[PDB]
Symmetry: C2
Subunit: 304 residues, 2 copies
Amino acid sequence: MIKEIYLAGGSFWGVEGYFRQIPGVKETDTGYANSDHAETVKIVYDSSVVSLQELLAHYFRIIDPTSLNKQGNDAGRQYRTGIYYVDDSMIKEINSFVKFMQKKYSRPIVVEVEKLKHFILAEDYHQDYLQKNPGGYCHIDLTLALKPLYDESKFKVPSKEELKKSLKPIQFSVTQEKATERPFTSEYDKFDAEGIYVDITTGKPLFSSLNKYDAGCGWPSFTKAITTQALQYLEDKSLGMNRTEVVSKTGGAHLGHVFDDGPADAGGLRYSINGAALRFIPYDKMEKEGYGDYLPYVKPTGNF
Amino acid sequence: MIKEIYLAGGSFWGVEGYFRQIPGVKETDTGYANSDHAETVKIVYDSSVVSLQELLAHYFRIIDPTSLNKQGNDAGRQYRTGIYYVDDSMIKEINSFVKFMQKKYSRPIVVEVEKLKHFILAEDYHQDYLQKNPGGYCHIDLTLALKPLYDESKFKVPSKEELKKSLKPIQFSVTQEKATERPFTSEYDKFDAEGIYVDITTGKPLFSSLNKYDAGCGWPSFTKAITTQALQYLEDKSLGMNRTEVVSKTGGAHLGHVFDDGPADAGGLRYSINGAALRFIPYDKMEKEGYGDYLPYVKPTGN
């Protein structure tokens, strides 16, 4: 579904410049929200591509959530940090994520969470400012939007030969030879436990149990990727058809195919992925195995 | 807020060609919805500009809601009429509007209302087909999108001199001389009855009571126009400020100004309109006075 969220993180020039580079974002607008108005960027996005969880993850990545009325050298009430909603269904998701982020800070997070009550659209001069004036001021490092959102230092790919002895034949065949496991053979087919599905070759998270559903086609099926940085798409005319191949962006390993016959309310996308290409990690064991940053993708309104 | 609705009304080439011309529509996509799929167009729109009511009004305008599995010369299950939702909050509005339209047809309406279950995006060939291929087939008259949605024959404009005898001085001043009534002086300021507000010079509907709220600035305030065909906007550098002037599209009469400090949940627009420029018509008398087509704009549910 198309959704919208309002984020105030300092000078909206950099904030818009960052989020405009993120997949799933369909429209950005700079303005003044909630006199002493905060500089805010309106974010219109497709939840089937990028989740609210990832958007808030990006948001906290480019701000100091412990700083009051000041981001970088820009000080004042117009630079206060805040997350403003127009959709009341987002309230528990937003609150849970802030509580989630608090666990990473000794100092109390001062990002305000309020219902958007006014949003005054800025002049065309301020709209796509850094696009019109590339030499413009920008505290945020815009190149970060094209860089990993999470620590991927541990998700490096082994060579061809390590994988051949480490993986089972079906695992190597699927990931390294674009093979396809036979339907209903994977343990992850009829499976609904809470947790994340990880790249069996690199350990990088690819899918969440929250997006998993029964397509009845015999393969693990998902409505979306866990992040916008997980997958890459390739034209595939194999077997005399026209299909899109799904591959790990980091790994490069073959995962499966993505179709357009998924549940329409979830975006209409069906990610058909071989179970052999995935390693399931239970929610309870996620934090201990180093996947603490991916908890909100499993439980958007989870207890933190 | 940005919202989306799915409409199946025959060959999606014409359906998309029509709705792409309607203000508030931000994105259109042709595809196959709910094997036996119906030809459907995905409509992404801004509810602050165009309401679901107007969109459904346009939809019924370009289709035969009594015809089963056939629109024009296109026959088959892929041409069946239907309205598909992904937002459950729209269900009662859609159902109410279909019941509303039934009163205009002797034969039963066969347009199906279902929750969207699948939507398969059509190839780029079928996307903006009539835009790429202007000689393409199209049952719908696309010029209708640039023509009045409702009968505007009774909304004729008098010349200045008739209005000079018909209107009160303050009504003439506001509408014909761009004057501004003093704050809190209009009866429509503190006013909350259900109905529509029409152009005092033409009788054409401009605003709905459902979109009315108290801005506390002393003037009748609205979050949006009743239709996309009601208002026209003009740059106004009056009084050394930067403002947008609101004028009747049909009349041309001055109504007021539109600001961006409105309630954000309603779209963030504040339409500040002089009460002197408006004539209020109660919901109970709307149908009797010939405004039966504008009922869903007041009461989206219940019809």
